[PDB]
Structure 1
Amino acid sequence: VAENAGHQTSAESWGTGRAVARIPRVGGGGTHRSGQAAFGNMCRGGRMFAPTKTWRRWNVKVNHNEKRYATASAIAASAVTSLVLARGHRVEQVKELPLVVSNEFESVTKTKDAVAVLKAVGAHKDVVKVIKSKKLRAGKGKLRGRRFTQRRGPLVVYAQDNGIVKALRNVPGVETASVKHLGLLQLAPGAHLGRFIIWTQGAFESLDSVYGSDSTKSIKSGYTLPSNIISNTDVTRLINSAEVQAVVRPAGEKTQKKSH
């Protein structure tokens, strides 16, 4: 708010003994404003309690390594079909994830042709999901430049941009990203894992250079992919393994019988 809002009056308290509350009051006469209360957060036309300031903290620092961790985790989530379906993408008619498409798609220049490719590789149902999800926003946000809302579509990741970016700008819901600059806002929108990602072959073959492997250092200086604290995540197989079952006592009843 403005620093002087509610403070542009010369009001003073009447003090006590005039049978009114002790809040400051506008002086003078001849207008209905005369005698009215001023300055207080409870007063009409006063200043608000603790007026908002610009030096509130707006941006937040995150450790760069942890941010890279989250990026890697979101990339891994995009290859899990259950996560992609839970995230809401219409990937029921795609044979396998990751979906990798040939590099000829990096040179498509017209929107019609790019939509043809999306239909062919079975990603257009998710675009149709975006088209039919358009709604007027609920509440005063529509007064503030955020008039419509819709779902997010697929993310197309390329190694070379020979027209693919411009060919896809006008398609509702579709996002494009260079394989060199991938971020969490595109990978886990709303903090929800499992973005539908369409890799070109060049980008898919560049991933191992970008993030590194056992055989290849990351191009990120001094960076290595994170290790898990557990090596086999299927704990049921671990528990029901021959090593474990050889040292467990026989199990009791699932529910104890009522004895008394």
Structure 2
Amino acid sequence: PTVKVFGPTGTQVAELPRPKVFNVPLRPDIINFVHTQLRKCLRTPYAVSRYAGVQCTAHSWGPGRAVARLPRKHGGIGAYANFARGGHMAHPTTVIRRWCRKVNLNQRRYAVASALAASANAALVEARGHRIADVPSIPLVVDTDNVTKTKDALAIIKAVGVLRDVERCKDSRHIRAGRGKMRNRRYITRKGPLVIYNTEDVARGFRNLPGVDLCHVSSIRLLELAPGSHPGRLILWTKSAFASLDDVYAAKQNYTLPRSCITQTDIERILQSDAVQKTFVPKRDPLVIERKVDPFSSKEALARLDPSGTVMPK
């Protein structure tokens, strides 16, 4: 099986063999685990000040003055309690919280490969959120050479059929709902296509477009492949990147790709096949259950038990 390769015009111009990294099993659980750990490794620490609440002078007045026993400032004002106005925190936050998390190298690689495998399905890409109604193929390889003007980059995206995804991103810019707009996160835009390039100057023509991201094929980012921790991203591939993918996995040293496995479609097929149906065997018939009623009421109800009639009816 071979992927198609289209021009910057829309016509079909080449065939190229499938890279093996798309044959890896689909693991939403592993992608969620890695996405969590790595996205949590990007944080900036925060903490309250270490002197806060404790710069004033306060001591307890003791019993015998008809007041509660907390420490008090000269004059009698409450202080040094978490329940006093102007006191310290009960357990102040501290920067020695462990902010990062560790992930093994195989697990990181496996998450990248499962995200790429998900990217090559016309069903998970449509179920993730992108608009793929007018695309020729989901492994989408287009020869572009060098794009330097946004107008020509938009022209290619139109000529291939990814124009509604970028318009979805463009017409969704709004101001977010909460406190987050006081903290340099005022606007939200949706996400569209990801362009992966190898030898070809494209960033200067694609970057401006809303909802577009750039990734050089030798260093692929899981947070870009699975935004929101949802795997199937729409990827516009350069010919050179799509042709150097296998070289990249060969450059990974003492590493082999994980073994491909079957799907619930394959289990379903096996079970309904004849080699498994030939060994079935029917169960015994179930009990027959009625609701208790008084046989002595009438003649037929009694005659279910004793038909001869020796027992009187009532």
TM-score where L is the length of structure 2: 0.73
Map residues 45-194 of structure 1 onto 2, 5 A cutoff. 45-102=86-143, 105-162=144-201, 164-194=202-232
Q: 1:168 to 1:4 in 2, by over 3 A?
A: same
SS class of match (1:90): coil
Q: 1:252 to 1:62 in 2, by over 3 A?
A: farther
Give 1:241's match in structure 2, choosing from 256, 260, 273.
Answer: 273
Measure the CA separation in 1 of the matches of 2:98 and 2:263: 42
Question: What is the CA-CA distance between 1:159 and the residue it aligns to?
Answer: 1.2
SS class of match (1:156): strand
Question: What is the CA-CA distance between 1:249 and the residue it aligns to?
Answer: 2.1
CA contact (8 A) 1:127 1:153 kept: yes
CA contact (8 A) 2:79 2:86 kept: yes
Measure the CA separation in 1 of the matches of 2:268 and 2:210: 43
Measure the CA separation in 2 of the matches of 1:124 and 1:251: 58
Q: 1:233 to 1:225 in 2, by over 3 A?
A: farther
Question: What is the CA-CA distance between 1:226 and the residue it aligns to?
Answer: 1.0
Give 2:234's match in structure 1, choosing from 193, 196, 219.
Answer: 196
Q: 1:2 to 1:225 in 2, by over 3 A?
A: same
Measure the CA separation in 1 of the matches of 2:133 and 2:90: 53
Give 1:8's match in structure 2, choosing from 45, 52, 55.
Answer: 55
CA contact (8 A) 2:136 2:160 kept: no
Which digits, 9 at most, give the CA deviation of each residue in 1:16-51, with x for residues without a partner? 111111111111xxxxxx321111111111111211
**What is the RMSD of the two structures over their aligned residues, measured on CA atoms?**
1.8
> Which runs of 5 or more structure 1 residues have no equivalent in the other structure?
28-33, 212-217
CA contact (8 A) 2:147 2:204 kept: no
Question: What is the CA-CA distance between 1:148 and the residue it aligns to?
Answer: 0.7
Measure the CA separation in 2 of the matches of 1:258 and 1:183: 62
Q: 1:15 to 1:106 in 2, by over 3 A?
A: farther
Structure 1 residue identity aligned to 2:252: K
Are residue 39 (structure 1) and residue 80 (structure 2) matched?
yes
CA contact (8 A) 1:188 1:194 kept: yes
Question: What is the CA-CA distance between 1:123 and the residue it aligns to?
Answer: 0.9
- Structure 1 outlier segments of 4+, above 6 Å: none
Measure the CA separation in 2 of the matches of 1:188 and 1:158: 18
Question: What is the CA-CA distance between 1:252 and the residue it aligns to?
Answer: 8.9
Structure 2 residue identity aligned to 1:24: P
Measure the CA separation in 2 of the matches of 1:188 and 1:232: 22
Kindly, what percent of the aligned residue pairs are identical? 49
The structure with more radius of gyration: 2
Which digits, 9 at most, give the CA deviation of each residue in 1:187-216, with x for residues without a partner? 0011101000111111111112222xxxxx
Question: What is the CA-CA distance between 1:259 and the residue it aligns to?
Answer: 3.8
Are residue 20 (structure 1) and residue 105 (structure 2) matched?
no
Structure 1 residue identity aligned to 2:214: T
CA contact (8 A) 2:121 2:138 kept: yes
Q: Give the number of the structure with larger relative contact order, counting CA–CA contacts within 8 Å between residues 6 or more apart.
A: 2
SS class of match (1:100): strand
Which digits, 9 at most, give the CA deviation of each residue in 1:126-175, with x for residues without a partner? 0111011111111111100000111111000111132x111111111100
Measure the CA separation in 2 of the matches of 1:227 and 1:233: 17
Measure the CA separation in 1 of the matches of 2:251 and 2:178: 46
Measure the CA separation in 2 of the matches of 1:20 and 1:86: 65
